[PDB]
């Protein structure tokens, strides 16, 4: 009867200690930048046939370790309305993959907050969708960020729900 938890860590997600990782992927399975680039530096072979549409997730196993490539929308290309739907869908596929894989924990970045943000602060939007999808899962979720003010805000958002 372990208590499923949410935690935040301010560090490179490629160094995670969880049972699987969510990559903030692009649709074509390219090395990309930011989080995707850091994931490519550690598990480049996880990009073998990882291309998948926006709003979906595709898991590639690296030995026993799952890399869940979750493709959020680029808000430079998507409208606020359609991008919101796609961002929800990506996270819903993450929850389904995490459940299917039977993992006890998962490392997850905030989708669509880096170069896909359209130059808007999307912390609250992305985190809200992350919770909406992951709340009904029982895996321990560890959210990764790099910015210290973002760490504070994510931590505050987690603490205030209980």
Curated annotation (Swiss-Prot):
Coiled coil: none annotated. Seems to be essential for minus-strand RNAs and subgenomic 26S mRNAs synthesis. Displays mono-ADP-ribosylhydrolase activity. ADP-ribosylation is a post-translational modification that controls various processes of the host cell and the virus probably needs to revert it for optimal viral replication. Binds proteins of G3BP family and sequesters them into the viral RNA replication complexes thereby inhibiting the formation of host stress granules on viral mRNAs. The chain holds residues 1334 to 1493 of 2474 of the full protein. It is found in: Host cytoplasmic vesicle membrane. Interacts with mRNA-capping enzyme nsP1. Interacts (via C-terminus) with host G3BP1; this interaction inhibits the formation of host stress granules on viral mRNAs and the nsp3-G3BP1 complexes bind viral RNAs and probably orchestrate the assembly of viral replication complexes. Interacts (via C-terminus) with host G3BP2; this interaction inhibits the formation of host stress granules on viral mRNAs and the nsp3-G3BP2 complexes bind viral RNAs and probably orchestrate the assembly of viral replication complexes. Interacts (via C-terminus) with host NAP1L1. Changing residue 12 to A: Partial loss of ADP-ribose 1'' phosphate phosphatase activity. ADP-D-ribose binds at residues 12, 26, 34, 114-116. Residues 3-162 form the Macro domain. Phosphorylated by host on serines and threonines. It comes from the Viruses. It comes from Chikungunya virus (strain S27-African prototype) (CHIKV). In the N-terminus, the macro domain displays a mono-ADP-ribosylhydrolase activity. The central part called, the alphavirus unique domain (AUD) has a zinc-binding function. The C-terminus region, also called hypervariable domain (HVD), is mainly disordered and binds several host proteins. This intrinsically disordered domain contains 2 SH3 domain-binding sites and 2 FGDF motifs necessary and sufficient for the formation of nsP3/G3BP complexes. This is Non-structural protein 3. It is a peripheral membrane protein.
